[PDB]
Write a protein that binds this ligand. Sequence first.
Ligand SMILES: O=C(O)[C@@]1(O)C[C@@H](O)[C@@H](O[C@H]2O[C@H](CO[C@H]3O[C@H](CO)[C@@H](O)[C@H](O)[C@@H]3O)[C@@H](O)[C@H](O[C@H]3O[C@H](CO)[C@@H](O)[C@H](O)[C@@H]3O[C@H]3O[C@H](CO)[C@@H](O)[C@H](O)[C@@H]3O[C@H]3O[C@H](CO)[C@@H](O)[C@H](O)[C@@H]3O)[C@@H]2O)[C@@H]([C@H](O)CO)O1
Ligand SMILES: O=C(O)[C@@]1(O)C[C@@H](O)[C@@H](O[C@H]2O[C@H](CO[C@H]3O[C@H](CO)[C@@H](O)[C@H](O)[C@@H]3O)[C@@H](O)[C@H](O[C@H]3O[C@H](CO)[C@@H](O)[C@H](O)[C@@H]3O[C@H]3O[C@H](CO)[C@@H](O)[C@H](O)[C@@H]3O[C@H]3O[C@H](CO)[C@@H](O)[C@H](O)[C@@H]3O)[C@@H]2O)[C@@H]([C@H](O)CO)O1
Lengths: 220, 224, 213, 213
Amino acid sequence: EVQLVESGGGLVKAGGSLILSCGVSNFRISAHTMNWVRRVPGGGLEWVASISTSSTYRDYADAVKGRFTVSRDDLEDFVYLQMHKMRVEDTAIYYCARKGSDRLSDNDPFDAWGPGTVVTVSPASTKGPSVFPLAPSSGGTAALGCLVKDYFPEPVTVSWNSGALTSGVHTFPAVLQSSGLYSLSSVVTVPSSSLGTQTYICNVNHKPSNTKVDKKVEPK
Amino acid sequence: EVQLVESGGGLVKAGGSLILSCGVSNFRISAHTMNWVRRVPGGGLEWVASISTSSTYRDYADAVKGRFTVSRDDLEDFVYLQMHKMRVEDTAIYYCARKGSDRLSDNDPFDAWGPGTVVTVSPASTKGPSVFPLAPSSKSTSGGTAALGCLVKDYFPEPVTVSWNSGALTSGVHTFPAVLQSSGLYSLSSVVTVPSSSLGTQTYICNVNHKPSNTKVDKKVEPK
Amino acid sequence: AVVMTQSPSTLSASVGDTITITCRASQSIETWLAWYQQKPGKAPKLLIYKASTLKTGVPSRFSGSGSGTEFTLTISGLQFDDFATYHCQHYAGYSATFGQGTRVEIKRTVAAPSVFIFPPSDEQLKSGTASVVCLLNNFYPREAKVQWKVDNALQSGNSQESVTEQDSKDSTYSLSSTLTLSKADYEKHKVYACEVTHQGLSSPVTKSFNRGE
Amino acid sequence: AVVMTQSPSTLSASVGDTITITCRASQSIETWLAWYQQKPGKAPKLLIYKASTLKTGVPSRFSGSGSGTEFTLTISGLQFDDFATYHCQHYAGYSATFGQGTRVEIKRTVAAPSVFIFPPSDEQLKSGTASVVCLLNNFYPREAKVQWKVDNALQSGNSQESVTEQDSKDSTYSLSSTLTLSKADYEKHKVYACEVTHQGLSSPVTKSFNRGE
Ligand SMILES: O=C(O)[C@@]1(O)C[C@@H](O)[C@@H](O[C@H]2O[C@H](CO[C@H]3O[C@H](CO)[C@@H](O)[C@H](O)[C@@H]3O)[C@@H](O)[C@H](O[C@H]3O[C@H](CO)[C@@H](O)[C@H](O)[C@@H]3O[C@H]3O[C@H](CO)[C@@H](O)[C@H](O)[C@@H]3O[C@H]3O[C@H](CO)[C@@H](O)[C@H](O)[C@@H]3O)[C@@H]2O)[C@@H]([C@H](O)CO)O1
Ligand SMILES: O=C(O)[C@@]1(O)C[C@@H](O)[C@@H](O[C@H]2O[C@H](CO[C@H]3O[C@H](CO)[C@@H](O)[C@H](O)[C@@H]3O)[C@@H](O)[C@H](O[C@H]3O[C@H](CO)[C@@H](O)[C@H](O)[C@@H]3O[C@H]3O[C@H](CO)[C@@H](O)[C@H](O)[C@@H]3O[C@H]3O[C@H](CO)[C@@H](O)[C@H](O)[C@@H]3O)[C@@H]2O)[C@@H]([C@H](O)CO)O1
């Protein structure tokens, strides 16, 4: 009868954050010290955190101190685990577990566990953009630009010709692709009669990954 | 200066779950009713949930009743929002917001807000695999045996089943545990060792079933 | 269960103008009404509560009035810093409801977009992906629609777009739409078109190209 | 902050055997010790607590003993369902420590893997990605080392492995390693190799191919 179930597992990039929750059935958490435990890919279990009745004591594994917070919600029977500054070695299956026995004592084993929720921390905490030309080709007025694609996290900055070119420039809000990476475009309108004479170069900077990219946009 | 900061936003699959937290600086949440509000793509704000002092009352927008839960932690000053059975129209920026004023009353406006965290629910709950042959060649042939297989890549979620020649070929088959890529999609391989003498005479086809997307693919794996 | 209706949805005006935003409640809420200002990508900011009380730090050009079911936010002498979205809000002890929001923008004459379409660069194609971009440049007002057609079949679920904030100099907007396909699908088809609908046009505009050319 | 050391890490046995897993604590923990069984993909199960108390429902073939610093879990008459991982645990009021776990597996003779390599398919390559697959077939024991080398340069951070569970028929394991590169990266190199080290192999086996054949 007594059950627990964890929610919130997912894929996160190094340095990112993820919050897990745990619900129960057929008992109240109020009288129980609640625990988080994880099974790392090697196969061993690691105790992660504990929160006592009334939240009087919250205790953490050294490996997660300063980065994880456990909370409890007695009125609705939930326990939470916040994970920040996450690292590759946080990759594991996370279980919610209660200390319990037919009669509660000052020190009981983990008698009930949830099925677990999978947490994965991918190693790269950033990724620099790929830049592609948007090549020109309405007369008199031409439009060209750069497509800044597949980067993370925000922001990028875009200048044109190291900044000498500011008029007619539009740098668009980035969009978040289904891939979880960002993409944006920067475009400029110029005299249809400067393409091939005037050089056009978009200057992309992605501070988070110390990446700088200059790209010549030519006709065709 | 009072501050609030949300954590936990990201990309979620329809049907999925996501939990947000909210932490504060330069005040204690205990005397304050705390709220969650979201700005939808159309630009309007939507009240999502509220939790009173002492957690005496929790209230929810009808659109989320039954799927969201709000919780508070007065001792360390956090507020939580659990989001389950997520829908595309849950897509929005989520803000944590304090109900308050210079001196509290039974009914104050939202006087301090977090910067917001972006939550995006994709319409696709599922994605079907690409299947590529692991063709037998001189590099996977030795003596009396040849190995061949299929690489089943970029699907979501687990599981997929793999059969060879519709179940006729079972001896020697190994279908490996799927692995999760940094892209958030799974991939796995299924391989089988067969007599080298049979390539060119026996046809070999991997039957891939991704039930979650109700997708089936039959892939003929041939030399070279 | 109190529905808050804000009007208008967009209010175009000029610096120096006095403007009025109305908020209506489906039933009496006495003076339990607040107004917030929000700029793109920033948190809402409380301006007025109890219908007419200004928060500390809110300039005196902002005022609010009303009770029961009809409320008004007034801005006397619009400044540049004031162009933003305004949200009214009924607040109760343990719940709240918001109006749809009102975007206050700079008024100018209608302007049709200039439209451009860009095929994928050969480089990107080589890496397996094909992003086609459609640009709608310097149009007004902000509402515009983009429909992608591939060999004349309307697309859906495979495009995203973003719109710039109102231009500082000519008060126009621009929009960028990206249609994304695998290299495989892209090569299955010949005609890629972006069709743009906007009040500045007498009818929808199409820009297209044939793959390969 | 107690260190718990199980022994052995892998325990190879046959059905009907009587086997003993040891758990040592780096300092005395009286009898505050529990044993858990866990099967792949499933939740840990409490078997024994306070060093020797059997949880109701647990078959009498499971038996726990010990105190202070040394503890044993004994299974008398090992049955097929007992093949699993076992974890000892020091439990205190507000924290716990686990051992590294002991996986109990079916005993068999050492068996070298057969190694096969698969270049990326032309179809995938065209789509912009190169997966190179190294297959280690039917080996024992489970411990194997696989290293990728691209033009003699050892690779790190760009491969993933998957190991099968013990084979129902020959008690062997099989393993797959996938090296993933962008088409562009993949095309910058010539020789791709996987080097396999294993206790049953006299020396390492290296399988290789040249990109382009
Ligand atoms: O409020 C009171 O009733 C009381 O006045 C009772 C007093 O006795 C006293 O409680 C303190 O001392 C108690 C007894 O201490 C002595 O006898 C104990 C044997 O009964 C012995 O172990 C101990 O060393 C000593 O010799 C303790 O039991 C009290 O500890 C409980 O309460 C505090 C909160 O004040 C908790 O922090 C403790 O973890 C513990 O609560 C847990 O155990 C009790 C049962 O013993 C449960 O009822 C309770 O729900 C909780 O159980 C959960 O947590 C434990 C530990 O993780 C798990 O093993 C369980 O499975 C549950 O998950 C306290 O020290 C006074 C105090 O002075 C202040 O009130 O309180
Ligand atoms: O000593 C006590 O605590 C006391 O004895 C005080 C008693 O008055 C009584 O409290 C109840 O009655 C109070 C007065 O109610 C009457 O007058 C009010 C006008 O001032 C009127 O609105 C009301 O309808 C009635 O006519 C109420 O103020 C009390 O309500 C407060 O306390 C209860 C808990 O008992 C909370 O659940 C309420 O939400 C409210 O607390 C909130 O407001 C007060 C300020 O008045 C804050 O101090 C408190 O931190 C909290 O503030 C936060 O939440 C509100 C609402 O979301 C926001 O608007 C704020 O910005 C904050 O976010 C109560 O009904 C008795 C009780 O009967 C039992 O003790 O308590």
